[PDB]
C-alpha cells in the first residue's frame, strides 16, 4: 500500500512535534517573540490593536489526528477530520493560551482566522478553546472558513472594523496573507526572503513538519495527485549529497 | 529491510526543512530574535560579550547528508559523516551568516561549540564556513568535540577567558547546557517548562525534525537498540486519537 508509505514518511516529524522538548521550546520562543512584538506595536490614532491568529498547529494541537492517520494508514479525509474536531480532544500549542490572554487583557484583541469550517467545526472548536483556557472565544472573535481557504479577505474584514493588525501568528505562510497561496515552494521561499525582517516581529511562525501549504508546494497539482504521485513528488524533492 | 523503514520515516520532515519557506521563516525568526537579544544584552563590568553557537542544523545545513541516507537506506554512520564533512558541501542555515557577522562586528564574539570532531572534521568545517561567508572562523573560535559530547565544560572554558555568554543558539536542548543531556523526553520537556522565559531570549532554537537528543529521548537506551527496536520506540511514542 502506497498509503502506508505516505503516512510512514511523517513518523519522525510527528515524534518531534509530539514528544520533543525542542518543539515545545520553539513554541515558547514564537510566543515570547510575539509578546515583545505586541508590547512594542504602534497603532495609528483611532485604531484598536488586533492580533490575527491561525488555529490548527498554531494555537490548537491536532497531533493526535496525525497519530491516528499513521496507526491506520489513512490519508487526509475531510469527514475523518470533522469527527476529530467533534471529538473535542484538541490540545493547546505551548505558549498559545498565555499569549492569547495577555493580548486580550492588555489593550488588544486576538482574532482567530482559521480554515476549520464555520458550518460544521465551529462548535467543537469553541468548546475546546474554552476548555483549554483561551479568553475571548465568543463567536465574533472567529473568522472560520466559508467558501474560500485564502485568508486575506478575512484580514481585510477585521481592518474594516477599525482594527490595525499588529501581528499575525501561523504555522503556514498562507497565515500571513495571500502572496503565495497555491504557489510552489520556490515562490514561497522567495516571499520569505523578501520579508526576512518581519519574522519574529510582525509574522510569527510555529513549526509544522507534518502538513501544510509547503506540502502542496512540493509539486504542480500535488493535492490532485494519487498517493503514488504524491510519494514521488516528496522523493523527487529530496536534495541529496552524491556520497563521494 | 527495517533500515528502509527507518529512513523513510524522515522523508516528510526532510522535505519540510529542505524545501519549505516555513522552515526558512523559522530560521529568520530565530536569528531576528537572536539579534534583539544580543542588542539588549547587559554584561558585567570587565567581561566581553560572547555568543555560543552550535553548528550542525544551527548554522550549517547538512540536509544533503540526510537526503543521501534516504536515497540509500543508510542509518547514521560516523565514517560516512566524516566523508560528508570532507566533501565540503555544507550549506548555511538562513540568517546564520548575517547574525554571526553582526555579533562579531558589534562588540561581541561568536564561539562555535560543536560536536563535529576536532581531530578529523575541523578542516572541512573551517573551509565551509569561510566559503559560506562566516567572519571570524579562526581556530580559536572553535570548541570542537574531543572526548565528550556534553557541552557545558566548553561553555565554562569560554567563561574562564573573561567572556560572559549572553545567548546560546542551537537546534538541540543540549546546546544550552547539560541539564538534560542523555535524558528521556519527559525530563527534556520539563527543562523547557522550567526555562520557558529564556526561549527567544537567552536560548535561541532552530528547527530540526530529522535527528537529535530528542530522538535518543524517545526510549531508554534508544541509540544502543537495533533498527527494529528504534522503529518500535518511534511507533510506541506516537500519541493517537482513537478514531471515535
Ligand atoms: Mg495552521
Ligand atoms: Mg546541532
Q: Do B28 and A196 touch (CB under 8 A)?
A: yes
Q: B204-243: b or e for each residue (b if 16 or more CB lie within 10 Å)?
A: bbbbbbbbbbbbbbbbeebeebebeebbebbbebbbbbee
Pair A210, B17: CB distance under 8 Å: no
**Nearest listed ligand to the Cα of residue B58:** 2
* Rounded Cα distance, A174 and A112, in Å: 14
Q: Which value, in Å, is the radius of gyration of the alpha carbons in chain A?
A: 18
- Measured between beta carbons, the chain B residues lying within 8 angstroms of A35 are none
Q: Is A127 labelled as part of a ligand binding site? A: no
Alpha-carbon distance B159 to nearest alpha carbon in chain A (angstroms): 25
Name the 3-class secondary structure at A23.
Answer: helix
Q: What technique solved it?
A: X-ray
* Rounded Cα distance, B198 and A31, in Å: 12
Ligand 2 center from residue B171 Cα (angstroms):
5
Q: Do B185 and A19 touch (CB under 8 A)?
A: yes
* Rounded Cα distance, B95 and B124, in Å: 21
* Rounded Cα distance, A11 and A15, in Å: 6
**Domains, chain B, ranges and CATH?**
1-244 (3.40.50.1000)
Q: Is A175 labelled as part of a ligand binding site? A: yes
Q: Do B209 and A237 touch (CB under 8 A)?
A: no
Q: Locate A29 and state its grid cell.
A: 520562543
Q: List Cβ neighbours of B225 (8 Å cut-off, separation of 6 or more).
A: B219, B232, B233
DSSP string, B219-242: STTGGGS-HHHHHHHHHHH-----
Ligand 1 center from residue A169 Cα (angstroms):
9
* Rounded Cα distance, B28 and B15, in Å: 18
* Rounded Cα distance, B217 and B232, in Å: 13
Q: Do A207 and B208 touch (CB under 8 A)?
A: no
Among chain B residues, CA nearest to A214: B20
For residue A207, which of A45, A22, A74, A10 has the smallest C-alpha distance? A22
Amino acid at each position: 500500500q502506497a498509503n502506508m508509505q505516505l503516512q510512514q514518511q511523517a513518523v519522525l516529524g510527528l515524534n518531534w512535534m509530539q514528544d520533543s522538548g525542542e518543539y515545545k521550546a520553539l513554541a515558547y520562543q514564537a510566543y515570547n517573540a510575539a509578546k515583545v512584538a505586541f508590547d512594542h506595536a504602534k497603532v495609528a490614532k483611532g485604531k484598536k490593536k488586533a492580533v490575527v491568529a491561525d488555529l490548527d498547529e498554531t494555537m490548537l494541537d491536532n497531533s493526535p489526528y496525525a497519530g491516528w492517520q499513521v496507526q491506520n494508514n489513512k490519508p487526509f479525509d475531510g469527514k475523518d477530520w470533522t469527527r476529530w474536531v467533534d471529538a473535542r480532544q484538541s490540545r493547546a500549542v505551548p505558549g498559545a493560551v498565555e499569549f492569547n490572554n495577555y493580548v486580550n487583557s492588555h489593550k488588544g484583541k486576538v482574532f482567530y482566522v482559521t480554515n476549520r469550517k464555520d458550518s460544521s467545526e465551529k462548535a467543537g472548536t469553541i468548546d475546546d478553546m474554552k476548555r483549554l483556557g483561551f479568553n475571548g472565544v465568543e463567536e465574533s472573535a472567529f473568522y472560520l472558513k466559508k467558501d474560500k481557504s485564502a485568508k486575506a479577505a478575512r484580514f481585510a474584514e477585521i481592518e474594516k472594523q477599525g482594527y490595525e493588525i499588529v501581528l499575525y501568528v501561523g504555522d503556514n505562510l498562507d497565515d500571513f496573507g495571500n502572496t503565495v497561496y497555491g504557489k510552489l515552494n520556490a515562490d514561497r521561499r522567495a516571499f520569505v526572503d523578501q520579508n526576512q525582517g518581519k519574522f519574529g516581529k510582525t509574522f510569527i511562525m510555529l513549526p509544522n513538519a507534518n502538513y501544510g501549504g509547503w506540502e502542496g508546494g512540493l509539486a504542480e497539482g500535488y493535492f490532485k495527485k494519487d498517493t503514488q504521485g504524491q510519494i514521488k513528488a516528496r522523493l523527487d524533492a529530496v536534495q541529496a549529497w552524491d556520497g563521494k
